[PDB]
RNA sequence: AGUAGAAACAAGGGCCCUG
């Protein structure tokens, strides 16, 4: 209105100059990004100091001037000042002014007529508030904890997305007339930006504030921290009043946010697509992709496109790996060895050729590794920190709280390092059949030897005792292991250590371009394998809530 | 009797009060002869004398790098480096990563160096103007220099990184540059001493080590190039494990305990280990700029022929940099009655009316000397390159030779800047003492040297490591971080979030206790009501604020919703320190007061910009100082108001100018004019417009347009 | 279905995706119209408009329009359902032989 | 991000990115002009259009 | 076609990479950097030795290949010339540390600790500021019954400081808090005594041959001895004062679960152990003092002001019999005085003035820097009354750091539950009450036997020490502070029968002796660790006495 | 509208559609009920002699 | 006078202003 007409003069009066006009005809729109540092620059290095100093002014604060006369805010209420007229000397256009006048407005200015609207603004930290009211404490107690440390997430939030999508989601809720053009996620996502602008609509709001709040409702912030019990975000955002290094304050808080389900039911139906494209044996590869696109599955209350969530989450598990190394999904360099987790710290390697007799002779090619490597792996509630050199185990240590999980870590430990007679000499209650080739699809010995060890505890024993046997000298009786799992023994295992307290998980914060083959064997710029088929299990039946599997 | 407090370190451990130690409770205290005596111990540690003459300044040139000669007590500095050495290093460490590593990080780095934008080079600490002479902050420094490039050539249409590097070698060989003042203009010779010239800060904000009492600040024609050499230093040293410099806190210490537990494990029975806890000496006077050009020229030989010229900029110039001497020496009479104050550049006149110390560390650099500067060829200063320096102490702890295994005996350990750690293992002590003088010799080789005194061993689970001493558990200090429980000094609102959000860390890091949270948190609730004014209603205090409060106090039935800025208590603890309190009393204002405070139509409020924290009437913007109301600095203030003005306008037409950067090909003349247009239209269509007033509209703009295409 | 989710059919739990052409009553905005319109090659001749007077416009007609910043451009509503997908695996399957 | 074909990747189908790398690979290019190439190629498939 | 270009044209735009570079046509597919002429002149200058044109480097380097043997023997042949000593301290044991000699060192906090005495009343809420109690006091007549002599025992400038007195007496009573500026307080005050500026351009040789011009000669810091009278400090900081509340605190939030209610009540114990100590009113004191100080230096600068010296606090709880509520006190210790604090910048200087009571003759050695006046007498039965004079200064940063003790609570709190959780996790209870009330701790040595007392009670030296630092604080402690950590590693090392070994101590004696000037905190805390070492010697290895 | 612990109903009354879905009435985790069942009275248990 | 450190302050700009 009047105000365009305002805005047009002083466009006018400004294009009048020359610097100005100069500016504002070379160049394109973006160097006013460039020209919003030139202006305003100005910091302090104590400001603690400076607002000690400051605020024991008259008037440390500025304000606008036009804003207090429309208010009616006087001057000088009960001869006490709020602010007197002058012009500060960056602005220019606002007026110097005291603490105390904000009390003024607080209790006696202008009155808006709603705002509810910030219970929208700020919804994750009110459901924090919530979270954390519908909790039921417990006693405390006193004792020392296994804190580990790791990567993981502290905010819980739903439909977590990348920037590049948020970037315009906050436009097309805000500023529309603004807007550019239509990026597919909103074509596919329509009615969660119609729900985002139904509550910021016909609203008096600063809209900058509402962008970064919806930013932040948006990101997981993820943090390398110490860690005890449980991992869910719902515990990690409070971990703080929840335990140390000396004290636990129990509570129950398995009730809450609704997470880890949405994740094990898209693994479900990960290996489920998984093993139906596996039942092909030329185009499993594109049987797969038709799947992917040819499903979608509810969230909450909206429908997401599966490839979608797909790329948004960071399960590292033997299936999304498939998916999304098929949907060129680049991922981290994280390993998998059937239920274990492995990730590598250093060395190196390459492939080399050996084999086996299976029963008298029957020659079966198996690879492995020629060179000095060091490995982290996880297994429930046990941790191993563990080297191989040339198709041997050279040394390990564990860090667990379980007999049976150490065990199983151990064997699967020297699985993956091919150590031992047995990969030498294979035992003859496997035979031909067993060997590979359900329907034609070859298989290594090595999960050979899994499975095996899977059937049957009696094959991880005679595998245990495949490892050297000693007795247990003195003073190396604590960290000594024998052949049940014990902590302690007269005879344990050869080159083996134990000791309370898990290890560090290590960290990295690269990503990976891999590929797969068409017998769904992922290959990582080597002969590695970081995923397969063979490492999930064997098959389930599921009944799949509100999903959609439009596909013959 | 007579009191003993150490005597507590009898009957119980070390690391669990090693905090009790550190004043950090207390005000930490605060040249020329300084930057002397530096250069003097540059000059003195190469261990050499041969000198050559520079084509370009006729000045001497002390060389040093692969000319060691001197080779006395070499327990003490040098620096003086054999690039084979230290190429040979570096092809270990290599072979023990892998190949294609060197390679894969440039490529990584050239991904960032082309798209970048040549405006963040505004963020970062304080730069040496080349026009005032004068440490100014990057931004004013970065837009007086593109001023000038215009001024004297024309508008700088870049807009990346490259462009501007171009552009500066090109200001290089030119004959006569412009720049804006009180209009002045200089040669070729003038610029290039001025533009290589360096500025020094006595900053050194953190305590930490109190031989560092400086900091350099160079120009703003290396800052890109530095820039190139940081990312590919970095992008190097984040794959490695031997090295903790990027990363902070947990992540070290795991680094150590994965390391720790590995040497265990590793070592046989007839083997012991044994630490160490090193403080590197004159590591920024050490390092040579040299042996970085070798070693850069080494790593891109495989990659593009265009990251090879880049890397080999900064080298060369800190090869030939200048340094600032400061406020000159003080002249005075016996009573101290007057006082007579001279500059660097006069020093050599009255040299003989100066003590003789000054004398006898001045006239030997009168050569190296011109104009209030001296032409240091090599050497290093603080800050300047701290992750190559890392990257090239690490190649030391992946050696290994024949020797070291003949006898089974291994060294690694971890390092950051000028501090290390080293774990060395044998089966007897008599070659434990050769492997240390082993990695003693191989660190000389390459200017690392080692300082004695602050440098001792013991056996393996006893060290320390930047302020975190390490046994079978971990001692948090707990006094690093005291000074974080205090009120940042931004705003009302804010401050309070900040320290909760800094005690929840501290309690979850630091393994800081419940009630020390708690007495933290009063501590900074009471130093907020101090600061700030401000007191409890309850309370009987006096003043301004608390006047009107009392005053208004009556309309309100529940003061528990209220604020602490208003007269509020605290309602907070250890389970709600990760909730503001305008969270937590927003289901109990009042709908008048809560109404009042969550307005958005305030004439207090202003965005900052980490910041979680809520936005209120109490998140206000502090007055601006006056002292340069005085000066007459104004000039320069008039270009910023211009911009500003264009800034807002445009703003003002498109209100997420700020939040999503604005792209596209047309100029802001453009999209100004058809946007208002739209806006004309769209409303008197429907709106309460007129023909009248869009005629009207129409009319201003196209003279406005013709005006701005006239001008020039 | 669902005011909600306007852009969905759901059919014995199977779900459909309704393209965005016209918007009815419900449809309150430009984002029901998205995909009836398509870039084109430029033509002065075409008008200006807005993005709420954008409904009036017929089926296969041209106009000029402003988007996002410092960007002008041309659009006609008609749309291509094909994407990129198969006319890209197509033809490069058919370059291994 | 970290390589121009993961950016590429972001706008473009990963097929026609792996072939405009093969052909820089072929004639021994900076891998910078990954992307002009692809934007060509899947030109040229979205021109045949079946 | 079209909708494809423009999706990734803006998708290029975002990402700054729609330029020639990602973007060229046929011809502009060369880019490299611009290498000029100079650029190439200086590379070409800046090679190593061997090398003389970056070309010569460029294909050593390219080629350069790995020759393990020359490597290690230049590697050897350093090791050979160098000879780096390896010393075990069991065998080269740790001499004691050499303290400096001359006169002692003195008092150098700006107020009276254990000299001080005040005159105290009742506080009504009504008069809280400083230039109101100032003059309640004053009205009852004892601060005016003051009537010094012109005769000093000890100082100098006495008749200065008794004309100030006066003019302050007779300010109070024009209930205006302000002096002017005469000859008196212009020399008390610095007034006029900042040196003259003497431009080189105005200046010849004959100018100089005049007045002697010379480079000034600065006068470090001259040496001192060991204080005898800070152990009498550190005993009476410890022992409680009459009253309580002196420090101000804050209130305790609610409580949900049993974490707080722990947290709750081990504060509260430590603070009301705390709050009744001397150290306490001190800080007080400090705390209220130095905040009323800088509202005035921010309020009134370029003019003279009188800032009282005083304190707030609450008369102890008495059992319910008698008077119950017990009442607050406002308790006055001395006078103050500021002088034209124009904080022009940070580290700058104010001077202010102290004017204190005492009821304690002083000592030479000790009180050397102040001016006592014999006053008259005073009440408690009747006793003489001495007035402790001296001047002294101020900054910024030490009026925030000083306004900011409370930290001393945070570090002392830290400490004990650490200890206390600590003892209660290895037995898995709880355990923190008997740890207060039990595990004894090492205070100090009587007759030349030990002393201990429980922790509860050993609290109070460790919050003096953090006092002590928060006060004393300089470069000298800090230096000191930060090379004493190798003594105590090598002592825990002793503890273990860790062999410990080190490279040069001597060296580091040296470092730590060499700031040890003129601060009675560093030399206290060396020879109470010389003590240490003596001490531990009877139980342990690698110190000499 | 008005409720105290909403989060807890809600996700039992997704539990319960899962579950009859599945044809069995039986719901396997116990979360939910186990608080809400608990809420009127749970806590340990000390013995006389160990007092 | 004094402060503190290994140099700086003990007001600075134009009769008027200012941290």
Same mark, same amino acid.
């Given at each position: ?30 160097? +006013? ?85 910030? !219970? ?69 996502? +329509? ?99 038709? +799947? ?114 150490? !065990? ?38 090595? +999960? ?53 307290? !898990? ?50 | ?104 990080? =440039? ?27 004068? %440490? ?45 003042? =009180? ?168 040299? %003989? ?88 010799? =191989? ?62 860390? %501290? ?206 | 279905? #669902? ?81 990129? #997908? ?12 | ?50 | ?19 020639? /570079? ?30 003389? @044109? ?67 009343? /009742? ?85 100089? @041959? ?40 804050? &209130? ?18 430590? &603070? ?118 001296? @001047? ?25 539950? @650490? ?86 101590? &001597? ?39």
């Amino acid at each position: 209105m009047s105000l365009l007409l305002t805005i047009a003069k002083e466009y006018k009066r400004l294009c009048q100059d020359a610097k100005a006009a100069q500016m504002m005809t070379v160049g394109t729109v973006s160097n +006013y990004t460039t020209f919003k540092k030139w202006t305003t620059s100005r910091k302090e290095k104590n400001p603690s100091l400076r607002m000690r100093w400051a605020m024991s002014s008259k008037f440390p604060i500025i304000a606008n001037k036009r804003m207090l006369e429309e208010a009616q805010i006087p001057k000088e209420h009960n001869n006490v000042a709020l602010w007197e007229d002058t012009e500060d000397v960056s602005k220019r256009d606002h007026v110097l002014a005291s603490a105390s006048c904000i009390n003024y407005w607080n209790f006696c200015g202008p009155c808006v007529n709603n705002s509810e609207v910030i !219970k929208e603004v700020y919804k994750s930290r009110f459901g924090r508030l919530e979270r954390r009211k519908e909790i039921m404490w417990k006693e405390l107690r006193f004792t020392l904890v296994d804190r580990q440390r790791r990567r993981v997430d502290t905010q819980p939030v739903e439909q977590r997305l990348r920037t590049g999508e948020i970037k315009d989601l906050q436009m097309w809720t805000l500023f529309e007339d603004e807007a550019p053009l239509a990026s597919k996620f909103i074509l596919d996502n +329509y009615g969660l930006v119609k729900e985002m602008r139904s509550k910021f609509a016909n609203k008096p709001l600063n809209k900058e504030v509402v962008a970064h709040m919806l930013e932040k409702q948006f990101n997981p912030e993820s943090r390398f921290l110490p860690v005890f019990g449980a991992i869910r975000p719902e515990r990690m955002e409070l971990i703080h009043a929840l335990g140390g290094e000396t004290w636990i304050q129990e509570a129950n808080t398995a009730g809450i946010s609704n997470v880890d389900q949405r994740k094990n039911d898209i693994r479900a139906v990960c290996r489920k697509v998984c093993l139906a494209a596996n039942a092909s044996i030329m185009n499993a590869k594109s049987k797969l992709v038709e +799947y992917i696109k040819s499903t979608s599955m509810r969230i909450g209350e909206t429908e997401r496109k599966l490839e979608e969530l797909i790329l948004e989450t960071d399960d590292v598990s033997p299936e999304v790996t498939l998916c999304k190394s098929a949907l060129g999904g680049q991922l981290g360099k994280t390993l998998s060895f059937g239920p274990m987790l492995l990730k590598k710290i250093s060395g190196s390697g390459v492939k080399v050729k050996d084999t086996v007799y299976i029963q008298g002779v029957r020659a079966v090619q198996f690879e492995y590794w020629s060179e000095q490597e060091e490995f982290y792996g996880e297994y429930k509630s046990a941790t191993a920190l563990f080297s191989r050199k040339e198709r041997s185990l050279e040394w390990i240590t564990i860090g667990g709280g379980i007999n049976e999980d150490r !065990k199983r870590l151990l064997a699967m430990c020297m699985i993956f390092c091919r150590d031992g007679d047995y990969f030498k000499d294979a035992p003859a209650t496997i035979t031909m059949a067993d060997l590979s080739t359900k329907l034609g699809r070859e298989i290594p010995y090595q +999960y050979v030897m899994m499975n095996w060890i899977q059937k049957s505890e009696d094959n991880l024993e005679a595998l245990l005792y495949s490892r050297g046997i000693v007795e247990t000298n003195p003073g190396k009786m604590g960290s000594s292991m024998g052949i049940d799992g014990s902590k302690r023994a007269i005879k344990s295992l050869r080159a083996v250590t134990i000791q309370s307290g !898990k290890i560090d998980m290590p960290e990295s914060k690269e990503k990976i371009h891999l590929e797969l083959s068409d017998n769904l064997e992922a290959f990582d710029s080597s002969g590695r394998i970081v995923a397969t088929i063979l490492d999930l299990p064997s098959d389930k039946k599921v009944t799949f809530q509100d999903v959609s599997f439009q596909h013959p | 009797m007579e009191i003993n407090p150490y005597l507590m370190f009898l009957n119980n451990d070390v690391t669990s009060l090693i905090s009790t130690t550190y004043p950090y409770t207390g005000p930490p205290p605060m040249s020329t002869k300084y930057t002397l005596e530096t250069i003097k111990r540059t000059y003195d540690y190469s261990r050499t004398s041969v000198e050559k003459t520079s084509k370009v300044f006729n000045i001497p040139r002390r060389k040093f790098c692969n000319c060691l000669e001197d080779k006395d007590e070499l327990v003490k500095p040098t620096g003086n480096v054999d690039i084979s050495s230290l190429l040979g290093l570096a092809e270990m460490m290599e072979k023990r990563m892998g190949e294609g590593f060197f390679k894969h990080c =440039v490529m990584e780095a050239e991904t960032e160096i082309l798209k970048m934008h040549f405006s963040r080079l505004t963020e970062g600490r304080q730069t040496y103007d080349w026009t005032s002479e004068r %440490n100014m902050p990057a931004a004013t420094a970065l837009q007086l220099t593109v001023d000038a490039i215009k001024e004297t050539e024309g508008p700088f249409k870049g807009t990346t990184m490259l462009e501007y590097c171009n552009k500066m070698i090109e200001m290089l060989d030119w004959k006569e540059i412009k720049f804006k003042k =009180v209009i002045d203009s200089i040669k070729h010779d003038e610029f290039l001493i001025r533009a290589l010239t360096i500025n020094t800060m006595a900053k050194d904000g953190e305590r930490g080590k109190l031989q560092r009492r400086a900091i350099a600040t160079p120009g703003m024609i290396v800052r890109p190039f530095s820039k190139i050499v940081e990312t590919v230093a970095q992008k190097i040293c984040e794959k490695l494990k031997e090295s903790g410099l990027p990363v902070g806190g947990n992540e070290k210490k795991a680094k150590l305990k994965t390391t720790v537990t590995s040497l265990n494990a590793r070592m046989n029975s007839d083997q012991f280990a044994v630490n160490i806890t090193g403080d590197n000496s004159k590591w920024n006077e050490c390092q040579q700029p040299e042996a970085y050009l070798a070693l850069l020229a080494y790593i891109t030989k495989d990659s593009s022929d265009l990251m090879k010229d880049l890397c080999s900029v900064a080298p060369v110039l800190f090869c030939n940099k200048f340094v600032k001497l400061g406020q000159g020496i003080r002249l005075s009479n016996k009573r101290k009655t007057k006082e007579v104050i001279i500059k660097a550049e006069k020093m050599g006149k009255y040299k %003989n009316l100066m003590r003789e110390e000054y004398k006898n560390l001045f006239e030997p650099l009168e050569k190296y000397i011109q104009k209030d500067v001296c032409f240091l060829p090599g050497g290093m200063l603080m800050g300047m390159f701290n992750m190559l320096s890392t990257v090239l102490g690490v190649s030391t702890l992946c050696y290994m030779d024949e020797e070291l295994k003949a006898k089974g005996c291994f060294w690694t350990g971890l390092q950051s800047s000028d501090d290390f750690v080293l774990f060395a293992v044998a089966s007897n002590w008599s070659n434990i003492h050769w492997t240390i003088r082993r990695f003693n010799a =191989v660190c000389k080789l390459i200017g690392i040297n080692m300082s004695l005194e602050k440098s001792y061993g013991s056996l393996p689970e006893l060290f320390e490591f930047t302020s975190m001493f390490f046994d079978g558990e971990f001692v948090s200090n707990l006094a690093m971080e005291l000074p974080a429980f205090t009120t940042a000094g931004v705003n009302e609102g804010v401050d309070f979030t900040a320290a909760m959000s800094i005690i929840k860390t %501290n309690m979850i890091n630091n393994s800081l206790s419940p009630s020390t949270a708690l007495m933290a948190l009063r501590i900074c609730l009471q130093e907020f009501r101090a600061t700030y004014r401000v007191h409890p209603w309850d309370s009987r205090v006096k003043g301004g604020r608390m006047k009107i409060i009392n005053e208004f106090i009556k309309t309100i039935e529940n003061k528990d919703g209220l604020l602490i800025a208003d007269g509020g208590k605290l309602m907070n603890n250890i389970s709600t320190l990760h909730i503001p309190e305008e969270v937590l009393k927003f289901e109990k204002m009042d709908e008048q007061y809560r109404n009042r405070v969550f307005n958005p139509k305030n004439p207090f409020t202003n965005f900052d910009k980490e910041n979680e924290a809520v936005v209120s009437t109490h998140s206000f913007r502090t007055r601006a100082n006056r002292t340069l109301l005085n000066t007459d600095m104004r000039a320069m203030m008039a270009e910023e108001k211009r911009y500003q003005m264009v800034c807002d306008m445009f703003k003002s037409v498109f209100e997420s100018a700020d939040i999503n950067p604005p792209i596209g090909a047309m100029s802001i003349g453009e999209a100004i004019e058809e946007k208002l247009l739209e806006r004309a239209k769209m409303k008197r269509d429907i709106g309460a417009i007129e023909d009248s007033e869009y005629e009207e509209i129409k009319d201003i703009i196209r003279d406005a347009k013709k005006a701005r295409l006239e001008s020039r | 279905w #669902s005011k909600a989710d306007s852009s969905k059919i759901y059919c014995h739990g199977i779900a459909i995706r309704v393209p965005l052409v016209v918007g009815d009553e419900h449809m309150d905005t430009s984002l029901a119209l998205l995909e009836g319109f398509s870039v084109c090659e430029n033509d002065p001749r075409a008008p200006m408009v807005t993005r709420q007077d954008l409904i009036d416009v017929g089926f296969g007609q041209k106009v000029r329009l402003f988007v996002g910043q410092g960007s002008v451009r041309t659009f006609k509503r008609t749309a291509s359902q094909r994407a990129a #997908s198969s006319d890209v695996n197509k033809n490069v399957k058919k370059i291994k032989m | 991000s970290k390589t121009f074909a993961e950016i590429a990747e972001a706008f473009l189908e990963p097929e026609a990115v792996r072939i405009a790398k093969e052909a820089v690979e072929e004639y021994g290019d900076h891998e910078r002009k990954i992307i002009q190439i692809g934007i060509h190629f899947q030109v040229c498939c979205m021109f045949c259009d079946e | 076609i079209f909708s494809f270009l423009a999706t990734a044209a803006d998708f290029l735009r975002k990402e700054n990479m729609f330029n020639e /570079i990602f973007l060229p046509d046929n011809e502009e597919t060369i880019i490299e950097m611009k290498k000029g002429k100079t650029f190439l002149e200086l590379r070409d200058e800046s090679v190593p030795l061997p090398f003389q @044109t970056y070309e010569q480097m460029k294909d050593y380097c390219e080629k350069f290949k790995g020759n393990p043997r020359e490597l290690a023997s230049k590697v050897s042949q350093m090791q050979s010339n160098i000879k780096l000593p390896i010393k075990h301290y069991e065998q080269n044991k740790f001499r004691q540390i050499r303290l400096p000699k001359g006169p002692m060192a003195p008092y150098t906090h700006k107020f009276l600790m254990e000299e001080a005495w005040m005159f105290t009343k /009742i506080s009504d809420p009504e008069r809280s500021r400083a230039g109101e109690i100032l003059i309640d006091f004053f009205k009852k007549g004892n601060l005016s019954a003051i009537r010094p002599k012109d005769k000093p025992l000890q100082g100098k400038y006495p008749i200065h400081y008794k004309n100030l007195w006066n003019q302050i007496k007779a300010a109070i009573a024009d209930r205006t808090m302000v002096i002017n500026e005469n000859d008196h307080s212009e020399f008390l005050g610095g007034i006029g005594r900042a040196s003259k500026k003497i431009p080189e351009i105005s200046l010849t040789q004959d100018v100089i @041959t005049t007045e002697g011009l010379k480079q000034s000669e600065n006068k470090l810091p001259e040496p001192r001895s060991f204080p005898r009278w800070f152990n009498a400090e550190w005993m009476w900081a410890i022992k409680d004062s009459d009253l309580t509340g002196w420090v101000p605190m804050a &209130e305790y939030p609610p409580a949900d679960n049993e974490l707080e209610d722990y947290a709750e009540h081990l504060n509260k114990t430590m &603070e009301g152990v705390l709050q009744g100590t001397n150290c306490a009113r001190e800080m007080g004191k400090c705390i209220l003092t130095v905040g009323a100080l800088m509202t005035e230096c921010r309020l009134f600068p370029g003019k003279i002001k009188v800032v009282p010296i005083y304190a707030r606090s609450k008369e102890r709880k008495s059992m319910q019999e008698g008077l119950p509520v017990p009442s607050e006190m406002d308790c006055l210790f001395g006078i103050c005085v500021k002088s034209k604090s124009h904080l022009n910048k940070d580290d700058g200087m104010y001077t202010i003035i102290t004017f204190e009571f005492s009821i304690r003759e002083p000592n030479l050695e000790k009180h050397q820097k102040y001016t006592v006046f014999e006053a008259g007498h005073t009440t408690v039965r009747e006793v003489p009354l001495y007035l402790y004079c001296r @001047t002294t200064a101020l900054s910024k940063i030490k009026n925030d750091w000083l306004s900011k003790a409370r930290r001393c609570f945070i570090t002392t709190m830290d400490t004990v539950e @650490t200890i206390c959780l600590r003892e209660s996790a290895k037995a898995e209870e709880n355990l923190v009450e008997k740890t207060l009330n039990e595990k004894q701790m090492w205070i100090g040595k009587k007759n030349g036997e030990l002393i201990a007392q429980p922790l509860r009670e050993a609290l109070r030296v460790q919050l003096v020490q953090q006092f002590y630092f928060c006060i004393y604080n300089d470069s000298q402690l800090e230096g000191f502070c930060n090379e004493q950590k190798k003594i105590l590693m090598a002592l825990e090392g002793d503890k273990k029968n860790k062999s410990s070994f080190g490279f040069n101590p &001597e060296g580091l004696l040296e470092k730590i002796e060499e700031c040890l000037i003129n601060n009675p905190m560093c030399l206290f805390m060396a020879q109470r660790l010389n003590e240490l070492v003596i001490e531990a010697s009877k139980r342990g290895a690698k110190f000499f006495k």
